Design a binder for this molecule. Structure first.
Ligand SMILES: [K+]
Ligand SMILES: [K+]
Ligand SMILES: [K+]
Ligand SMILES: [Mg+2]
Ligand SMILES: [Mg+2]
Ligand SMILES: [Mg+2]
Ligand SMILES: [Mg+2]
Ligand SMILES: [Mg+2]
Ligand SMILES: [Mg+2]
Ligand SMILES: [Mg+2]
Ligand SMILES: [Mg+2]
Ligand SMILES: [Mg+2]
Ligand code: NA
Ligand code: NA
Ligand code: NA
Lengths: 101, 152, 144, 66, 71, 105, 142, 183
RNA sequence: AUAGGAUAGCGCAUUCGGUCGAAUUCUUCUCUGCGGGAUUCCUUUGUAAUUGCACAAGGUGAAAUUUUGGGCAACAGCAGGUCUGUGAUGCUCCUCAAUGUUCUGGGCGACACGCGCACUACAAUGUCAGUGAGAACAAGAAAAACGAUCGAACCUACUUGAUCAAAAGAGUGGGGAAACCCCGGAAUCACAUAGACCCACUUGGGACCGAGGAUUGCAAUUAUUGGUCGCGCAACGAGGAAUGUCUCGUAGGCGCAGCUCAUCAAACUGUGCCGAUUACGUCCCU
């Protein structure tokens, strides 16, 4: 029974300080792992004018938000997986449990 | 010399010959056989609303059906929306910028119906249009004829 | 049985990536996206892809089947990407299955004709900037 | 009708807008000729480099130094 | 325009003073020494320091250089 | 705004009423004479094509139109016929352009 | 076409009371008459069964009579309803295809009809203004 | 098995040369199959002088907004131009091109403070020859039954002979006539 | 070949993303978090040096000089713009037939005219009608509402409509988005298409206007927007004096997406595609 581990966050450093921990805890659990895949980084772009009144040279503000996503597929039961995931993550990182068929 | 086999090479298939020659030779074969169904609407209607004039070739439906069959050979499971992209063009909108418009799927629907009646196309399982075994055999055999330079 | 002799190379003109699979076969056969060399249009782009053969000679492609799959880019950048993948494939095959005196004469012949036959062009599209219609040109200015 | 001159050295861009270059040229003539190995200073329009050849078609004038 | 700013020149003069014995006439081996004997946020500056330390060493082999004091 | 000094409403109104038409034609133009080119072959013109057009070193639909005072559409049609009967040979060919020349001997 | 010019070739052809250039190809000389366009003239040649590759000056007297009948009553020759320029006349209610002086006469009727009821479109036409909701500022100006 | 390239597989570069002693180092007769090469010829100041002369001719046909960026089209126009050139002159069209370039630009010009005659550098003579020939053919074919390759071939053939029927030669004669008067 | 040229092949012959077939192997292309890599590093009987700081050509190289393109950007100011972004605000004005707030209708679009910035052109290096090969950045659906935790809004593919125009209208399935769209069939482009036109305000150019029909919306008249047939006899055949932007994947050309968006891009913000001429300077003008 394959369980899918989806990790996504705004922070590049925090998004893989949990995947490394999830990878390590499962290696201590001896469960076969399909390696953490780095899904494409999606950038949210918002381009607005700098001015609040429409005066002067029309200068613009490019704002970007990057999303980092990883997935780990492991052949482990629900109870064993819950042991792997039962630890404190950092703020701004959410981990999703999914069962594949 | 020009039609001789290169050497250690036998026969031909689709994509091995010129796409225009295959389509021209297929349309000639469709007209000579006479079994293909040609709608009456093709005598007045335009191939697409992106075009501003009706087709100038009296055998434009025969060419379109041959072109559709080759398209189904290259991309099995293709529908009328997919073929509309292949046969689309850029429309003149007057004093306003030109934009790409896909071909009308009506003529492509008629063309797929005519080829289905001929037994050359099978509605693919789980969506799309696919060639039949007779259609695949017809495509390669005609491609060999073009390479041989028979040309009907 | 006979061991399989096969290599893979790529070309990188603009956004076009062409991956050529060169293998030992009974008869020479080079196809780009399934289209043979003699069927590639226009004749000017066909002559460019054929340059990956004629600079060294047809004798070096004698028993090689090359399947170039080109994706991305446009018709011209796909031709320059494909002709580089073919030329790099012959060098890679001769490096793997031939001595070094060969494939060094071949490499010199390729580079003496066109450096871009073996080395990818670094040029890439320059981004558009605001207040500009493209990379360089600015908005029209009226002083009265 | 025209005599070929070889640019010996570039003496600098001449005048405003820098479109004219002052050069020193050596007249390319056969040995023993009156023009053999003789040198004049000339004004050149266009991009010029050392060891560049010009057809002078008149070798009597000399450009004023600048 | 490839002038070494005073941050690169001062740091490369400090490295020669402190690790003269370990340095050499080549960029690549010197750059390896600069990598672990320096703390910097930028690899480019470490690359420019390694380029100028080698320039100092080639200058030192020909004679004394102002700003370098080797006891 | 650049409000003009001492400009009236009557001055305004008289300005727009006189601003219609008048100033134009900033180019010389230099008009040309019309080209009277026949759209179909006459007996004497068709005779020239079958005899005079061969043994021309360079043959082109636009050249033949300039000689026989005919349209290029039918000038090209006659040239395609002269090739069918091997009187002229085709040296360069494309969809838009054809070049012919006379045969040897 | 490599066909000799007939002795009856005419440079100007009369059809529905308008001069038609005989040097032009038939589908492109038939559009010289009002109410017949490029798309309609090709349909007339097909209904008349004549070759579109011929010049208009080679049309015979009976051929001109045939193409004039199809122009006058296209729906009689199996030309569909949607191909016509008066599908439901606001006065008579009958589908037709105007041609030659009928296009101009019916257009004058249309404007006179709108003017009499004093509709907004009629008022714009009377004043010589744009009627399709266009900004007339900085436009026209002859 | 390697073979020397021929332009459009028809015209041989062997024996190609410039009659002028000048422009010998600024006209490239390097063998090629097609005018289309994708090289960074503008990176160095005189690197464009190493571009094959037929490609420099092709680049000169990509003018105006409707011709900008059309190099495959310009190569096809040159394919027919060389065939027409061969019929007109019965020589190598590659050689006729080289002779047309060598004669197409004035040797002396005037500039500028008072107007004075100045010599023209060899790089500018090749640039102006390609520019004036393509410009003269472009305007000749603008509203004309004559095709573009036919107008371009007639221009190159006249410039190769030095005849005043060529736009480049007619322009060259007036530039030198003024330059002589400004000595 | 109905005339059929040029262009690779000379232990096992090629194809078949619907043949929606299995097994095995792997990371050549693709995804990416940290790294590496380039710095005047190397060489001139070069410039300069008479210490140096450097410079120019070439080399190495994917990249050779702020590597390329951006972001950030001091201190002093301007009576520059914004009190029409805010529950940012002092003073002052109106305050129950109100300058508050709703609702109906109109207006913001109104045209003798002048100006800025775009779009489309004036054609044959073309317009039509076919056929081929072919990108990249991106966007996609809903509540403490409403129905029985999902399910409907959002985007699409396939089929149908179709026993006969387009635009439509329907049914089914998929997609919370590297999963469906999607093997993303963009347009420039190409075609030896043996296609039509043939120099003319013309099959260039579509302004303007007429009649039918469909869709968005509570509402289409002052045409909302498509699609069909007509008008095209509206100028326009390259633009006076003047004047803008630009140095290489650049200008110019060509589309595509997002954004405004119930409906509506001649806009902007990005994106890729085809791709040059000229200069490698100067202080004449600003
Ligand atoms: K700033
Ligand atoms: K400040
Ligand atoms: K502006
Ligand atoms: Mg257009
Ligand atoms: Mg348009
Ligand atoms: Mg446009
Ligand atoms: Mg870009
Ligand atoms: Mg200050
Ligand atoms: Mg209100
Ligand atoms: Mg307003
Ligand atoms: Mg309507
Ligand atoms: Mg706006
Ligand atoms: Na012309
Ligand atoms: Na206030
Ligand atoms: Na100045």
């Amino acid at each position: 029974q394959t369980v899918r581990l989806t990790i996504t966050s705004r922070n590049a450093k925090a998004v893989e300080s949990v995947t490394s921990q999830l990878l390590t805890r499962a290696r201590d659990e001896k469960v076969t792992i399909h390696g953490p895949v780095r899904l494409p980084t999606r950038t949210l772009k918002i381009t607005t004018r700098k001015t609040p009144c429409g005066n002067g040279t029309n200068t613009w503000d490019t704002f970007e938000l990057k999303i980092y996503k990883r997935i780990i597929d492991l052949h482990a039961p629900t109870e064993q997986v819950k042991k792997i995931t039962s630890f404190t993550m950092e703020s701004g990182v959410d981990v999703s449990i999914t069962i594949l068929d | 010399n020009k039609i001789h086999r290169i050497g250690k090479r036998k026969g031909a298939t689709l994509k091995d010959v010129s796409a225009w020659r295959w389509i021209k030779t297929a349309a000639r074969h469709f007209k000579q056989e006479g079994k293909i169904f040609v709608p009456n609407c093709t005598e007045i209607m335009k191939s697409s609303h992106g075009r501003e004039r009706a087709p100038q070739n009296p055998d434009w439906y025969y060419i379109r059906c041959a072109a559709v069959l080759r398209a189904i050979y290259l991309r099995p499971g293709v529908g009328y929306g997919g073929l509309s992209k292949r046969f689309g063009n850029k429309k003149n909108y007057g004093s306003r910028p030109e934009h790409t418009v896909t071909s009308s799927t009506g003529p492509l629907h008629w063309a797929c119906k005519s080829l289905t009646k001929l037994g050359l196309v099978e509605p693919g399982a789980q969506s799309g249009q696919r060639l039949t075994r007779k259609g695949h055999k017809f495509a390669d055999s005609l491609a060999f004829q073009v390479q041989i330079r028979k040309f009907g | 049985s006979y061991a399989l002799k096969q290599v893979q190379t790529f070309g990188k003109k603009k956004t076009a990536i062409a991956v050529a699979t060169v293998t030992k076969a009974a008869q020479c056969n080079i196809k780009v996206n399934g289209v043979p060399l003699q069927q590639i249009l226009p004749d000017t782009l066909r002559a460019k892809i054929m340059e990956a053969i004629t600079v060294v000679g047809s004798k070096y492609y004698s028993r090689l089947r090359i399947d170039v799959a080109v994706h991305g880019g446009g018709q011209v950048s796909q031709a320059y990407a494909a002709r580089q993948a073919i030329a790099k494939g012959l060098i890679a095959f001769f490096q793997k299955y031939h001595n070094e005196v060969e494939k060094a004469a071949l490499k010199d012949k390729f580079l003496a004709y066109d450096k871009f036959l073996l080395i990818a062009d670094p040029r890439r599209c320059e981004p558009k900037k605001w207040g500009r219609h493209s990379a360089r040109t600015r908005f029209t200015k009226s002083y009265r | 009708q025209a005599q070929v001159g070889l640019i010996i050295k570039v003496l600098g861009r001449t005048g405003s807008r820098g479109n004219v270059t002052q050069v020193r040229v050596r007249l390319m003539a056969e040995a023993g000729s009156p023009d053999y190995n003789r040198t004049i200073v000339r004004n050149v329009k266009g991009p010029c480099k050392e060891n560049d050849m010009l057809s002078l078609m008149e070798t009597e004038r000399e450009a004023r130094r600048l | 325009g490839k002038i070494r700013t005073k941050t690169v020149k001062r740091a490369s003069r400090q490295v020669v003073e402190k690790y003269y014995s370990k340095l050499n006439f080549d960029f690549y081996q010197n750059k390896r020494v600069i990598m672990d004997v320096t703390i910097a946020e930028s690899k480019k500056l470490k690359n420019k320091i390694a380029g100028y330390t080698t320039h100092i060493m080639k200058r030192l082999a020909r004679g004394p250089v102002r700003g370098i004091s080797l006891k | 705004p650049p409000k003009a000094g001492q400009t009236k409403k009557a001055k305004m109104e008289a300005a727009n009423k006189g601003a219609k038409k008048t100033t134009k034609k900033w180019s010389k133009g230099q008009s040309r004479e019309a080209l009277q080119n026949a759209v179909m072959f006459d007996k004497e013109t068709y005779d020239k094509l079958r005899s005079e057009v061969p043994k021309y070193k360079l043959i082109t639909p636009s050249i033949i139109s300039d000689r026989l005072k005919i349209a290029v559409s039918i000038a090209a049609a006659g040239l395609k016929q002269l090739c069918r009967e091997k009187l002229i040979r085709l040296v360069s060919c494309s969809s838009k352009t054809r070049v012919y020349t006379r045969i040897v001997q | 076409s490599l066909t000799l010019i007939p002795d009856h070739f005419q440079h100007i052809v009369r059809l529905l009371n308008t001069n038609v250039e005989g040097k032009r190809k038939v589908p492109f000389a038939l559009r010289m008459v009002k109410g017949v366009g490029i798309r309609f003239a090709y349909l007339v040649c097909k209904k008349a069964g004549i070759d579109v590759e011929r010049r208009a000056g080679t049309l015979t007297a009976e051929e001109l009579e045939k193409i004039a009948e199809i122009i006058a009553d296209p729906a009689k020759f199996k030309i569909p309803d949607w191909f016509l320029n008066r599908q439901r006349d606001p006065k008579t209610g009958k589908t037709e295809h105007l041609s030659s002086s009928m296009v101009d006469t019916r257009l004058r009727d249309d404007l006179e009809r709108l003017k009499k009821m004093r509709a907004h479109r009629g008022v714009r036409h009377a004043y010589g203004l744009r009627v399709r909701g266009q900004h007339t500022c900085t436009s026209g100006r002859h | 098995s390697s073979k020397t390239p021929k332009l459009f597989n028809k015209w041989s570069f062997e024996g190609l040369e410039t009659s002028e002693l000048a422009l010998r180092d600024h006209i490239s007769t390097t063998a090629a199959y097609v005018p289309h090469t994708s090289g960074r010829w503008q990176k160095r100041r005189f690197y464009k002088a190493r571009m094959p002369i037929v490609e420099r001719l092709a680049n000169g046909l990509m003018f105006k907004g409707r011709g900008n960026g059309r190099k495959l089209q310009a190569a096809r126009l040159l394919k027919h131009t060389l065939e027409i050139i061969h019929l007109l002159t019965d020589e190598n069209p590659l050689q006729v091109v080289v002779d047309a370039v060598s004669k197409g630009a004035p040797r002396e010009d005037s500039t500028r403070v008072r107007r004075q005659a100045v010599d023209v550098s060899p790089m500018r003579r090749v640039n102006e020859a390609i520019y004036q020939m393509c410009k003269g053919a472009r305007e000749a074919a603008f509203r004309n039954l004559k095709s573009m390759p036919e107008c371009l071939a007639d221009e190159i053939v006249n410039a190769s002979k030095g005849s005043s029927n060529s736009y480049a030669i007619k322009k060259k004669d007036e530039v030198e006539r003024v330059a002589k008067a400004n000595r």
